[PDB]
Amino acid sequence: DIATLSPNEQAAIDAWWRAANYLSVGQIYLRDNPLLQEPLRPEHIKQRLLGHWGSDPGLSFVYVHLNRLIRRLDLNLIYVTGPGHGAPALLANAWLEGTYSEVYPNCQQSTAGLQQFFKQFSFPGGIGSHCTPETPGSIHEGGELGYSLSHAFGAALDNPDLIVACVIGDGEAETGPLATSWHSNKFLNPAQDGAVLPILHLNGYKIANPTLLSRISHEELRSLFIGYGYEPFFVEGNDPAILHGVMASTLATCVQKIQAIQAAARSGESSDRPMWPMIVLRTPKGWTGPATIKGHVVEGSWRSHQVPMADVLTNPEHLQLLEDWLRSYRPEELFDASGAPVAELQAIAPIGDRRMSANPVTNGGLLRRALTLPDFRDQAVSVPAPGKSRADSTRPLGQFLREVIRHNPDNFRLFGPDETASNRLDAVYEVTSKVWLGDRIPEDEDGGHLSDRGRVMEILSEHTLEGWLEAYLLTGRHGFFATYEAFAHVIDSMVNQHAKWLDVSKREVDWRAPVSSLNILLSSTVWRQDHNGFSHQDPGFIDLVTNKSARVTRIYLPPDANCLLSVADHCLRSTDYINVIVADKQSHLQYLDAEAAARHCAKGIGIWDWASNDQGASPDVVIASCGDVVTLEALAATALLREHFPDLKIRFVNVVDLFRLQPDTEHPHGLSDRDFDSLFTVDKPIIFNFHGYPWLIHKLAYRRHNHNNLHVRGYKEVGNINTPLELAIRNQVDRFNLAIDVIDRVPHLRDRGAHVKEWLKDQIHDHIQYAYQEGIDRPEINQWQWPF
Amino acid sequence: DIATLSPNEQAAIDAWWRAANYLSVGQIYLRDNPLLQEPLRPEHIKQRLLGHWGSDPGLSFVYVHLNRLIRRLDLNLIYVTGPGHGAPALLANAWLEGTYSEVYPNCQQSTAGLQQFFKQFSFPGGIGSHCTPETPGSIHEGGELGYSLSHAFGAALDNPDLIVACVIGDGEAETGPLATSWHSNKFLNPAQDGAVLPILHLNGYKIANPTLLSRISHEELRSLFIGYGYEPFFVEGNDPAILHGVMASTLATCVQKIQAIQAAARSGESSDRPMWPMIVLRTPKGWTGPATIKGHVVEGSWRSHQVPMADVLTNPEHLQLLEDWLRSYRPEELFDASGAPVAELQAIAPIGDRRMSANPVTNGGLLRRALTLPDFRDQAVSVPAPGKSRADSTRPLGQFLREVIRHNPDNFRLFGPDETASNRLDAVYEVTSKVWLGDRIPEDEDGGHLSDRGRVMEILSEHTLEGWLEAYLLTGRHGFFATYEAFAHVIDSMVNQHAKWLDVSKREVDWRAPVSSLNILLSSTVWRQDHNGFSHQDPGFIDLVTNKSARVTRIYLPPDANCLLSVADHCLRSTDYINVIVADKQSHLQYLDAEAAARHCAKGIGIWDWASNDQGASPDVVIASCGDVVTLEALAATALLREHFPDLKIRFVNVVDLFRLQPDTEHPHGLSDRDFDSLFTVDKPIIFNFHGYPWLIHKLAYRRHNHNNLHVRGYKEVGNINTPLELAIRNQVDRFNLAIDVIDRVPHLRDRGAHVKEWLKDQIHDHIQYAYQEGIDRPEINQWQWPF
Amino acid sequence: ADSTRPLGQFLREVIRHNPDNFRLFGPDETASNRLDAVYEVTSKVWLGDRIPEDEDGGHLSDRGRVMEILSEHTEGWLEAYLLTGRHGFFATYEAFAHVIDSMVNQHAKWLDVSKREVDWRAPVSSLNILLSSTVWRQDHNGFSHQDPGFIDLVTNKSARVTRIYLPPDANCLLSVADHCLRSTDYINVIVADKQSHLQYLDAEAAARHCAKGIGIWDWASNDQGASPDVVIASCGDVVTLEALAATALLREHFPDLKIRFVNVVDLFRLQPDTEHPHGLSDRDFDSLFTVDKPIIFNFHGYPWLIHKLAYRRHNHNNLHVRGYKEVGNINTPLELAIRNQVDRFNLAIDVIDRVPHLRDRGAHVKEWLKDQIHDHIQYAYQEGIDRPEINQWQWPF
Ligand SMILES: Cc1ncc(C[n+]2csc(CCOP(=O)(O)OP(=O)(O)O)c2C)c(N)n1
Ligand SMILES: Cc1ncc(C[n+]2csc(CCOP(=O)(O)OP(=O)(O)O)c2C)c(N)n1
Ligand SMILES: [Mg+2]
Ligand SMILES: [Mg+2]
């Protein structure tokens, strides 16, 4: 009798639904007089109205039904919200359940607390309009549309009993990231993971236009959602008496199929991809609000979004209509004299931790356990001489990630956009394979590592791929993202959304526990110009990350494999940061030992003693490199200068943590003025060789005393197709161009080095001519190694 | 049958008691191999041993009995710990109950978590030996001995159903603050407050000496506890079979009397001070540990404190004795294969929020509600002309505190050590009176304001009085402390103890929610030399507070009544600070309006425009004052200089928030370099007139550019008896001495002002001679007022 | 060698030679501070019931010259004992010195008025307080967040009534204790550490050192007959070891560097001669600390106290103080020094920054020192104890 609904409890469900809408309108409009004991006056209304009403009836409608299903089947829900502006619906339900009062004791369940609850919403020094980290039981910010469904799947990536209900707006479904994210059901594993229940809020209208998915035929819509792999269920109408029975029946129909699918998967009798249930709602937008106000339809139209009435203080007629709107819910029966909800509402509320707004999954920091990290020195390469031994840097990282997977089989996953095999990270394929959950052929068995059980997800769309990881970290688990640098502009919008969540959660919100860090690995840098990716790769993703504060993002550019392992090991321990690691796929030199890499990453910036020419004397020039390809050119430039100028004294500095360049005033993590002056001399010129746009170094090191003597060579532009050496020549980061620049800046080499500067220009022209004749660099360029 | 014990449950209680002691020794000694699956080896033992063992058996003994009693009577307990070094006992019980695993997911209830649990204790990057804020269910740090009983009463000051069980060591009872704190039962109100059950751990030995209270006769000890007003109960012996029955019976005897007392008080039939229950334990120190190790008695002696055996790694014989010590608890039956406690231990543990280590009272920030306070502008005095109207500054504050009491009748109390009437704070006596709960005479009714119900605590022992407030804030309530400045050295030790609690809770601990701030009001400054207090008052309390970091303490020196109200209003909103407010009882001038005071306290330090001589031109000298008495002298010096030097341009600056002087690098609260240079110009001399030791200003403003031009006048020494004017002359903070100082620093007044400097010295000599003949200052000195 | 044992033997000899007008006071820390040498001839006084277990373990008898009680307030015994005309000695932890904060100000008030204002008051014996188990060692007893702030509040009182002594080793401790038992109208605060340490001064050399109060250590000083490049000064005893260890590192890595080592025992000698006749003159101060070379002061306690005393000096702007700032929850003795930057490596880093001709030459060494800081912290986290060569360090020259 779960599908059927009793009439007596339907009134209580409707009573909860009315109370949620009453509190929703109250915080949008009312500033004082919460229970309308006295007649409404303009001083009780907020001066500026930034709330959104169009999505509020739908979210409150679904939420009360879900509480009914939790009471019977003892489920656990999260309710990630799609539209994101339906926060008044969420906060009203959280207040009714008592969760909001427990989290915020000021907003007590009383008349005075109700006045404070309405006052704080959409107000300075108060909670925001969208669902922010201050909102209890929320993981998705929802301000940017299209990433809600991916966050639903990410939260259930390794929780078997968890159920998540994501409400999808029809306008939101027009976005590109949401269109692809439907296919994520295939990657989800029914045996060991939870179930996601997507709900489509097809109200029919956007802010100003009819939605695309509402103006397609019912047959076309059913065809479209069958192709995504979901079982479509349709709930239509605008009569609450009809809608309560139908929507309760459909929810009970879907959850039993969800339990049937999960039980069949765990039993192993049905090892195939099932059609997941899904619910479609055709309820009009704002169907519980005013119908017509100014001669136009304000219910079930685009006018219902965020503005029922434009002016209330100016026009007393609208205020009277507003007062009649609040009276339509009959608030007198819903609340007692004290202002608390009546005993009818208290009984039907979930009890204890089962409340969706109080679920520990949403505050994933409490659920988070520290990762078990094997020592990376086992997988580190051995270097007898720094700069003379050549080995690929991807293989040590792949072995290290494999060991973490075995030691952390549940709370760790790896993400790649069909580049894990390309990135030479096949070491993790030894113990675990990619998860596909589709039809397979024996040709696939020999070719690709595909299985139903796996810890590596591979989908081309980085929008849904990165969305999975963000929810995975906010749930309390740990993850790692590896991709090319050329396609990092795709996740540019999503990174700012996640960095916004961490920034507010760290400072403003006090009950939010810290979650795991966001680790993104960028490979196949712009300098190598691999076969994949467009010809004009852009390292501009590093710049937009630096626009965000240094207290939420960290950028690491390790030169070799050992320094890459130390960065990867250290970043897997951090909590409230976004870690961007820029390594290169191609085989390179190795400069640091396993022990020396740990000391290097501890400081972030360090002098390389073997590369440095003279110690115990003031250097004539400081040569600095940041990336790994540009580090080789910086080292090669040092070899040329030491060969031609034996008396020249060169200090070589390699930087891994970019934000160490920022002064100590900007952030405590940055180097102090005395520390910076020790590394980079106060007066001698600095020849910085930076991977990426050369101006980024000037932004960080602007406040430094020696900023005027800082010279940066970096990425400027790229030709259609170039050799690795020729590309460095055009950007003037080549070994010869750096050696030319050192001659210019050093005061006593501008006259002595004229002959050498002429010789270097001959070498630039000679290598370019050989590149045009043969198409490949000279063998001594490719096989170069440190001569000292 | 609550007093009696079943034999079967006694074994489970003993099983819990053994497991707590086993975990206690494990974290003191073991670093690896928690369950002793393999034979013990020296690499499993911690190299440096800092944990304390002497108090551990006693604390674990009481804790398990309390969990027995909390299961049957469904009570709520806090268990404030006296010795403070019994943290291994508390952490073991918290781990057994599952609270520690929930708070710290790394220390999971498993074999791996047990290894981590033992490893972290007394280790770098781990929990400390004493009861730190990291310890769940702890409000008292316990490192300083003697303040535990006051914290027991403070936590129950307004929680009626709460029960607090504070364990008192016999060596701790020799301390002065603990001896007085016994009388706090009289001030506790049984009708509206909880009951505190003190327990004496009379183990007989200190770290090196027999305790005083164990070496007195049983008759005299019983006489002493009767004099304190407690009903003494004695539990003795060293046999666990006997001790389990007797101690459980005594606990059941005491709690029913506690419930009888509370029920009788709330019924109103017994309105008299009752004899509260008291428990004495004669159990030997470390009576569950080794007896003899090196030919000396290590059980029940002073050797049992913190060192069972001195060396374990060096001597394998002690390691064998250590291994036999762990085997004596029979750990195999207590834990399963996974390492979790067996089902016998799980059943007897408290369930949910009823756990003593998981009570929300201990983490009072969750329980804290924001204080509802009226607008202070209602009680602010009216000033038509600044500096010309004379009114006492204490009366507006007393009225403001009275209004807060009415609006917050439950979560607010006021504390004053026999000086609330002296400080002219009788405005709060209008609505509420001080609580005494003793015999009363009609002479007391007319003279004093005493009643059973009250919100003002009055006891001149500043030790026990300040201890009540600290627990009251950590419980989540709000309070206010008002006392003389002369006796502020008494609570000097307690402030440092509370400051280190807030410092750790803010930064290191993440689950600690912010508590209310500590507001201390200092009256009767050293300059007025009131009748009370010693002749040589010391303002040195301000200096020791500044030794603590600026991010945990704030010091405010409001000049007048309106600025006092703004400071008091602002500090009642703050959360994680110690607020020290220094004002003077004596009637003074008024300089700021109600609106202007709010702007002044917003900036903290600002230019007084009316006192400033010339605007739109560079001032010749900056005259700054910090206190209130010295502000009058600074203003009077300005009047003299403007009278004798019409062309002189003087900028007057008043400083209220002391820590604003610190540079922005030291703390974000401090003024920036540009802001400081605007207030005090970069080149002109600054004549600072500071209440207190003059060097404190140089400590704060040391890093400033214009520090070398800063001249501070302040308290140096005080004669035996002096007039208020003559005392300023001795310390050279008088109006004439300040005017003399300005003449010296200003370059163009050193020659022109020679005649005026001679005249000022005549005025100094003239007033001193009049003071010797008459004993009082001249009438125009006392009735001075701003002439412009 | 441990520095507590020579003081205990000396206190025992005073007790026998002065059986009536001398007593010792300790708040259950005389045995803790390894002062059991006085237990040989005299025992603690209890006057209560006794058991044979107490007889074997504790030294208790009806007749005794050592007072033991937990409450430091009932220091009140000693103050009246001195005003009676007799002599005493107080030994306690530094962590609980804030307890007697109010009482000390009362006694110093009495002495200052009696010395100057009152003429018929005859001088009485001095108040000698010994503070043991300093904040740097972090012993098992006491709260983890020990505060050396008691030294600061004593300095707030006039230099004519309070004297603060920080002897580095056992011999310098005896000379301070011997000298302070002769003084009359002063409050003597002696800060020594319980734990076993190095020894730097001979019996004769300690007497000369305490006579001057502050003096150059010739063996620790690098070059004589030439102007030193930097002056390394230490005041306490734990920080003296770090100051010496920093000197060893700099002399090893910079053979040409000239370092003058100065040790300060009497704190108030830093005050100028104008403030008090006891303080050093301007010429004497300029001889010890050069007028232009940087001074790397390593002070036990709050680092600002040195700036208060030496504010009026000509070379105050070149004075750099490293001292106690904050303490972690639990740390190794070396790790605690790293947090407050008084470690041997942090001092060596500060010398490199301050010396003008080492800011460029010492960049490699400064990088090496930062590696040593990180390496020792990592070893501390893995093992919980410092490396064996750190604990067993000794002067290599
Ligand atoms: C990519 C993108 N395009 C446009 C917007 C602006 N926007 C915010 S809410 C909204 C309304 C669309 O919401 P819909 O999915 O129709 O939700 P419903 O009203 O049915 O809840 C729009 C256009 C946005 N945030 N992101
Ligand atoms: C005022 C003060 N003096 C000395 C100490 C040093 N101390 C720390 S713990 C301790 C032992 C306290 O003895 P007791 O109260 O008998 O405790 P238990 O026997 O239960 O360990 C002492 C003396 C202190 N903390 N405070
Ligand atoms: Mg819509
Ligand atoms: Mg004891």
Author numbering:
A (entry chain C), B (entry chain B): 9 to 796
C (entry chain A): 399 to 472, 474 to 796
The authors write:
Phosphoketolase (XPK) belongs to the transketolase family, a member of thiamine pyrophosphate (TPP)-dependent enzyme superfamily.
Given the importance of the physiological role of SeXPK, we solved the cryo-EM structures of SeXPK, both free (with coenzyme TPP/Mg2+ bound) and complexed with the non-hydrolyzable ATP analog, AMPPNP. In contrast to the published XPK structures from Lactococcus lactis and B. breve/longum, which exist as dimers in crystals, the cryo-EM structure of SeXPK is a dodecamer composed of six dimeric units, forming a circular donut-shaped array both for the AMPPNP-bound form and in the absence of AMPPNP. As the donut-shape or four-leaf clover shape-like particles or two-dimensional (2D) class average images were not in perfect symmetry, we further examined whether the assigned symmetries were pseudosymmetry. Some relative random motions were observed between different dimers in both SeXPK dodecamer and B. longum octamer assemblies, suggesting the likelihood of pseudosymmetry in these structures. The root-mean-square deviation between the structures with and without AMPPNP-bound is very small: (0.42 Å from 7,897 Cα atoms of the dodecamer and 0.36 Å from 1,256 Cα atoms of the dimer).
